[PDB]
Design a protein around this ligand. Structure first.
Ligand SMILES: [Ca+2]
Length: 223
């Protein structure tokens, strides 16, 4: 995260750090929702480690759990559908993050979090960082990215005019979320891509969770 601040321990307990340099959210205690580009494909896989329970990755209180299987969005090829599920060998006993099933919350100011770089070319972070990024319309986002932006599969956020606050290398897969009508966090995006980080005119692009919610839920029932 570029232009963020340290998240308090226990603030976003659904966050998990993934071994390949990605973030993720606890969709279920033993199912991590992350980005399709964080994994190589679907299948049995015990090589991924998810670290949960702590903002400080060096904490002795960290819970490190290995994966058992990965389900990457069917048909993923780098043009949208940027979601994936990772089944864990054991559950991480922390609150989960509900995903948006409608587009009612695809607006307003969102919150993002991760252990990714806090500057372009920077190193990964020991402590979880968070930031608030405003929703950016498809039109404004398209003025920057043109056809690279996938209509109805991607939502953008950040400051189009002046930049300064954004997700960056290492934050991919993390959830982008906001409060729902019941004062509970709800996931509207998955950190996906962007040109650089926090640059004026280039907002961050996120997987539009509402579009994939039914697919994600069905896929999770099979793990
Ligand atoms: Ca959209």
């Amino acid at each position: 995260v570029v232009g963020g601040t340290r998240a308090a321990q226990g603030e976003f307990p659904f966050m998990v750090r993934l071994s390949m340099g990605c973030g993720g959210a606890l969709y279920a205690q033993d199912i991590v929702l992350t980005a399709a580009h964080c994994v190589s494909g679907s299948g049995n896989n015990t090589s991924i480690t998810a670290t949960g329970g702590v903002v400080d990755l060096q904490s002795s209180s960290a819970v490190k759990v290995r994966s058992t299987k990965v389900l990457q969005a069917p048909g993923y090829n780098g043009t949208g559908k940027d979601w994936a599920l990772i089944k864990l060998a054991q559950p991480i006993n922390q609150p989960t993050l509900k995903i948006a099933t409608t587009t009612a919350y695809n607006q307003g100011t969102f919150t993002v979090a991760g252990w990714g770089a806090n500057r372009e070319g920077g190193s990964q972070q020991r402590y979880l960082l968070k930031a608030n990024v405003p929703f950016v319309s498809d039109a404004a986002c398209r003025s920057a990215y043109g056809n690279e932006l996938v209509a109805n599969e991607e939502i953008c956020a950040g400051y189009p005019d002046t930049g300064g606050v954004d997700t960056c290398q290492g934050d991919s897969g993390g959830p982008m979320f906001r409060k729902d009508n019941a004062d509970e966090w709800i996931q509207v995006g998955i950190v996906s891509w962007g040109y650089g980080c926090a640059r004026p005119g280039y907002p961050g692009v996120y997987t539009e969770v509402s579009t994939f919610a039914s697919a994600i839920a069905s896929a999770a029932r099979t793990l």
